[PDB]
Ligand SMILES: NCCNS(=O)(=O)c1ccc(-c2ccc(CSc3nc4c(c(=O)[nH]3)CCC4)cc2)cc1
Ligand SMILES: [Ca+2]
Ligand SMILES: [Ca+2]
Ligand SMILES: [Zn+2]
């Protein structure tokens with residue numbers, strides 16, 4: 153046995169938005185991020201506008217209400233908790249960073265896909281070409297294809313769709 157969600161139908165809520173991007177650009181970016189995993193697993197993700205959801209996403213700075221505070225510009229950038237109740241599964245992004253949909257700063261989609269991998273029970277990868285490798289890089293690929301090391305890893309938890 154490993155650590156994982158018992159249900160295949162998960163809900164997320166975007167609690168607050170970063171000033172660095174428009175509501176629509178944020179929402180598009182996170183939705184594409186969950187799709188990364190939904191496409192290769194039986195998992196399904198639906199967004200809630202209110203109330204408590206399984207994966208609760210928020211932006212914040214410094215001491216933000218958990219034992220893992222951010223540090224301002226540079227340094228740490230996001231973290232997410234493994235599956236479980238309450239804080240379990242949630243994702244936090246440091247809003248002293250610069251979030252973008254481009255080549256500049258941290259690309260919010262890529263970092264969300266990474267952080268959501270942790271939310272589903274994945275650990276970091278040893279393959280520098282994985283999405284779950286602990287070092288951020290931006291490859292500027294024409295379109296994004298989820299690398300094989302990570303499709304293997306998430307499927308070990310949930311199986312193919
Ligand atoms: N517990 C340590 C936390 N350190 S952290 O907060 O500073 C941190 C560090 C790195 C990442 C992070 C690392 C890698 C990625 C993904 S990199 C990437 N993968 C792929 C492509 C690409 O262009 N870039 C193409 C396909 C796979 C995202 C976030 C997140 C938080
Ligand atoms: Ca930081
Ligand atoms: Ca939660
Ligand atoms: Zn946090």
Ligand SMILES: [Zn+2]
Nearest residue numbers: 266270276286
């Ligand atoms: Zn990570």
